């Protein structure tokens, strides 16, 4: 049955940004669009956050540089990984790791709520990510289901540090952050707040979503949701363990100081349940604190300058050279060719 | 829109791909029913495309018909839009045509009769599908037609003209290629002409390596007619696939056409056709009353016409009462 497959509006040719080939929009931002793209050289898949600075005042531009420097600080298996930054007279391109699984919340809609054994595994991965950030003086401030992503193995990757900010222990912050349902009651009231304690509440709403498949606080209008957040009251389904209810009930506490610290959340009885986890305690210990020559030889064969490659890596400028090393390195762990 | 809920469906396998959507087979957890879900990524939609699906969703609400796919529930999340519709076990007609070849005119008529009743039903309701292709023709377990993908469907008032391009190019009437303004029902009819040719011949009436080649082919209005085709069928098609839109048959003339009337007499066909010119089922409500869910809120869901988890379980159970469960 001979036939051709024609495209109604003849679709134009794909855009390319210097070895990247843009596929589809995968995110929308305040001043950005996120597009999935392919690195033509390494065949790897990546996300690219694309920012049009023409429409930006000078303030917005500094906030974006702050975000970029924060991202440079975080190389963590459960934090989205920044591969390279490109800038032109007019555009800023952020090339970050691509998460095949997508939003966790949509994934739950498809497959239902998490059995606590599962929820414990992922939450452990999330906390190692957030603890790593807090230990390095950063707060996400927008920890929501939508910013929690899954790779092909369904491991967490936190993403979109646009609302993230640097902080010193005990500073107060004045600007609002994040999605309202994951917002701690102080943000609604508008008080100044300590950064990590507001993430803890957001991490509380996250845990509830994982085990129950529901939101603790929700409303038809912002005022209604606002009422529900301030009440500090929520449903607990019968299937939840008492240790989990203890954990969540003590994370989602209206008094910011009455909230647990990140250190005892890792020690909480619910976390210790199940088979003992050495790898978890290791990543938590690491938070307080070489020359893959195979890839190096491969890049030289492709004609990339051996000396310049080393200079890009040591200088830590995320450029055309460092990104190909990082990408070929991630491919080399997968045991694929070079 | 309306908020999505975790643990009401279990999505399993891809069954279609669309411009900005994927359709996946899923099972309704409460009723164990099988359903199809079109999943749309809102990040991929500009403001115009967002309104387009809202129009599609509004149009699906208007149609409750045995040969039109039924929309059960609409769900939305931050990034995704969910359309939960009736699942057609037989699948695409296109798939069936690939697997088994052209259809004998006897069966082609059985299917085609079912198709026009749906298309005529839509037209009677001031709706035009505009994308009628073998890929949007589905079969249920009884091998009955179900029309699908009202992505291009649009409302109209008789004698209004429409301006935007629509649908698959092989099934496009020559005026859409030319870019002229057009009467909606007349383009549905050409598109149905191509469908009939596809069913009876297992071939495309118009095709080309490039869109320009194909376009030239449609504009010529000339096509092959096989020797194995009945003289009556050729007449029908030749009068459907007419370059001058006004010169094409009306849907009334299509239903009364000599090819349609061939074979054994059809009371059920003419009945459905008549129905197009111009039922609360309390039995399930007690079954739902048995699930302990609030009768007052369910009735408000049905009157309010908001397609939620209440509407889905009602519509699904209602299908069980037709199934004789
Ligand atoms: C607007 C600001 N956004 C960011 O910073 C940001 C971000 O947060 C909004 C997320 C990503 N991001 C990385 N991989 C992704 C994969 C999906 C996805 C969706 N469906 N699917 C299934 C297809 O297989 C996959 C979606 C987003 C992804 C990148 C970002 O820019 C660095
Ligand atoms: C993106 C636009 N698509 C739509 O509107 C759209 C659509 O487009 C034509 C079709 C369906 N649809 C409903 N039931 C189906 C069953 C099969 C199927 C395939 N194999 N099998 C078993 C035999 O192999 C069954 C395939 C598609 C089905 C749903 C849709 O979303 C409403």
Numbering used by the authors:
A (entry chain A): 47 to 335, 344 to 392
B (entry chain B): 58 to 335, 344 to 390
Describing publication, verbatim:
The salt-inducible kinase (SIK) family comprises three isoforms (SIK1, SIK2, and SIK3) that belong to the AMP-activated protein kinase (AMPK) family of serine/threonine protein kinases. SIKs have been implicated in the regulation of several physiological processes, including circadian rhythms, bone formation, skin pigmentation, metabolism, and modulation of inflammatory cytokine production. The SIKs control gene regulation and act as a molecular switch, and inhibition has been shown to reprogram myeloid cell types to an immunoregulatory phenotype. Inhibition of SIKs in stimulated innate immune cells and mouse models has been associated with a dual mechanism of action consisting of a reduction of pro-inflammatory cytokines and an increase of immunoregulatory cytokine production, suggesting a therapeutic potential for inflammatory diseases.
The crystal structure of SIK3 (60-394 T221D) in a complex with 22 was determined to 3.1 Å. The structure contains a classical bilobed kinase catalytic domain with a flexible hinge region connecting the two lobes and forming a hydrophobic cleft serving as the binding site for ATP where compound 22 is bound. In the crystal structure, the kinase domain of SIK3 adopts an active-like conformation (DFG-in, αC-helix-in). The kinase catalytic domain is connected by a linker to an α-helical ubiquitin-associated (UBA) domain. The UBA domain packs onto the N-terminal lobe of the catalytic domain, forming an extensive interface consisting of 536 Å2 in buried surface area, distal to the catalytic cleft where 22 is located. Compound 22 binds in the ATP site with the protein adopting an active-like conformation (DFG-in, αC-helix-in) and as such can be classed as a type 1 kinase inhibitor. The benzimidazole nitrogen of 22 establishes a hydrogen bond interaction with the backbone NH of Ala145 at the hinge. The phenyl ring is out of plane relative to the benzimidazole scaffold, and the side chains of Val80 and Ala205 provide lipophilic contacts to the substituted phenyl group. The amide group forms a hydrogen bond contact with Lys95 but not with Asp206. The pyrazole ring is coplanar with the benzimidazole scaffold, allowing a displaced π–π interaction with Tyr144 and a weak hydrogen bond between the slightly polarized C–H group of the pyrazole and the carbonyl moiety of Ala145.
